[PDB]
Design a protein around this ligand. Structure first.
Ligand SMILES: *[C@@H]1O[C@H](CO)[C@@H](O)[C@H](O)[C@H]1NC(C)=O
Lengths: 48, 48, 49
């Protein structure tokens, strides 16, 4: 037999979309801790 | 949004570094030190 | 009761059938042999663990 995994595909999708939206409105702050509201070109200016 | 006040915190993590190193004598395992067992054991060579 | 078993099912405890004296069984003696040498270039004398 085979068993389906616990963490389903749409969960696997919805954990992945929040990796994008939080990177697209909070950027470095999305991972650094509490995610902080900021423009995306400012985030690029931080990265660059 | 920029942080004004903050905190610090200690977290712990735990990860093994060694193992219970063992050893198995064959004679007191596969034989129990009967004379019969040691002599059929020569038919398997130095497998132990 | 007449004989004890250990936490694995080998008989380690014998009560004497004649005197009702209960006795532990130990193993005889077994272990490993190691050899200590300083190198055949260095000596010909050994120590044995
Ligand atoms: C080790 O052996 C070589 C010859 O095999 C010998 O010339 C040398 O003196 C030896 N080493 C020592 C410390 O005696």
């Amino acid at each position: 037999t085979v068993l389906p995994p616990l963490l389903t595909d749409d969960m696997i999708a919805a954990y992945t979309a929040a990796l994008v939206s939080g990177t697209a409105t909070a950027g470095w702050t999305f991972g650094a801790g509490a995610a902080l509201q900021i423009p995306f070109a400012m985030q690029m200016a931080y990265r660059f | 949004a920029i942080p004004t006040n903050f905190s610090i915190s200690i977290t712990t993590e735990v990860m093994p570094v060694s193992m219970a190193k063992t050893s198995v004598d064959c004679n007191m395992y596969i034989c129990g030190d009967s004379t019969e067992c040691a002599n059929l054991l020569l038919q398997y060579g130095s497998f132990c | 009761q007449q004989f004890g078993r250990d936490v694995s099912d080998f008989t380690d405890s014998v009560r004497d059938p004649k005197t009702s004296e209960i006795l532990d069984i130990s193993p005889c003696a077994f272990g490993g042999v190691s050899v200590i040498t300083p190198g055949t270039n260095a000596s010909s004398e050994v120590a044995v663990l």
